[PDB]
Paper text:
Mal acts as a bridge adaptor to recruit the MyD88 molecule to the activated TLR4 dimer on the plasma membrane. The overall structure of Mal-TIR consists of a central five-stranded parallel sheet (βA-βE) surrounded by four helices (αA, αC-αE) on both sides.
The crystal structure of human Mal-TIR (residues 79–221) was determined at a resolution of 2.4 Å using the single wavelength anomalous dispersion method. In comparison with the TIR domain of MyD88, Mal-TIR has an unusually long AB loop (residues 109–129) and lacks the αB helix and the BB loop. The crystals of Valkov et al. were obtained in a solution containing 10–12% PEG 10,000, 5% PEG 3,350, 0.2 M NaCl, 0.1 M Tris-HCl (pH 7.3), and 20 mM DTT and diffracted to 3.0 Å resolution, while the crystals for this study were grown in n-cyclohexyl-2-aminoethanesulfonic acid (CHES) (pH 9.5), 150–300 mM NaCl, 10–20% glycerol and 10 mM DTT and diffracted to 2.4 Å resolution. Both structures of Mal-TIR identified the unusually long AB loop instead of the helix αB and BB loops in other known TIR domains and included two disulfide bonds (residues C89–C134 and C142–C174) and an additional DTT molecule that linked two cysteine residues, Cys91 and Cys157. The interactions within the interface of the symmetric dimer primarily involve residues of the αC′ and αD helices of both monomers. In this dimer, the AB loops of the two molecules are oriented in opposite directions, facilitating direct interaction with TLR4 and MyD88. We conclude that the AB loop of Mal-TIR plays an important role in TLR signaling through interacting with TLR4 and MyD88 simultaneously.
Author numbering:
A (entry chain A), B (entry chain A): 79 to 109, 128 to 221
The structure:
């Protein structure tokens, strides 16, 4: 519950193919919000899933997405799916019943992602 | 932990399109194992996901699969994915890092599913 219970406020879970976009999101988020690219030993309050064509094709990415949602946004943790570079028709069906940010929104979805992160940080002590 | 902590030993989570196959699995499982088709108020020790073309296309099915795995086979609960009537190339990428039963196995995968269920029941008091 403590804002300091975790070293980072948000990390970006991405596939190698989208390194650049992920770095821009991290940059956008930090402009305070502490951000980084997600990694094995990475632990933050919020986790952004950069769901792209490369992400959906990668078995490890999909499994990570699964674990990200395993213990997260049901309503407890903070997992933010960001659909980027994908046709809506190719979106994972389950998202229809879940919260997510569309990449066609303002700032490629970056703005709503940052907002979602802040909303969650405000609920911390 | 108690074998009686739940009224059913296993329910079959399926899409309307596969009612028949689901009923045969339920029949096969019971031949003791108490089985039924999963429903809203349904709660059992094991949950079998009848992942078919219709299942993967259905947003609610996918969301249910997500919740089924939300609090389940990470290693705690009992969720058994049964891939039936699908080309391996169309399998959800995440399964590569997960346990699942292929429908091309003995008895359309029914045998290994039943075995998985029994293995789990034996760990109960």
């Amino acid at each position: 519950s403590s804002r300091w219970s975790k070293d980072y406020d948000v990390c970006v879970c991405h596939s190698e193919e989208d390194l650049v976009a992920a770095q821009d999101l991290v940059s956008y988020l930090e402009g305070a919000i502490v951000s980084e690219l997600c990694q094995a030993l990475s632990s933050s309050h919020c986790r952004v899933l950069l769901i792209t064509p490369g992400f959906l094709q990668d078995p490890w990415c999909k499994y990570q997405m699964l674990q990200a949602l395993t213990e997260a946004p049901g309503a407890e943790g903070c997992t933010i799916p960001l659909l980027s570079g994908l046709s809506r028709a190719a979106y994972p069906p389950e998202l229809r019943f879940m919260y997510y940010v569309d990449g066609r929104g303002p700032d490629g979805g970056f703005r709503q992602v940052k907002e979602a992160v802040m909303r969650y940080l405000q609920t911390l002590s």
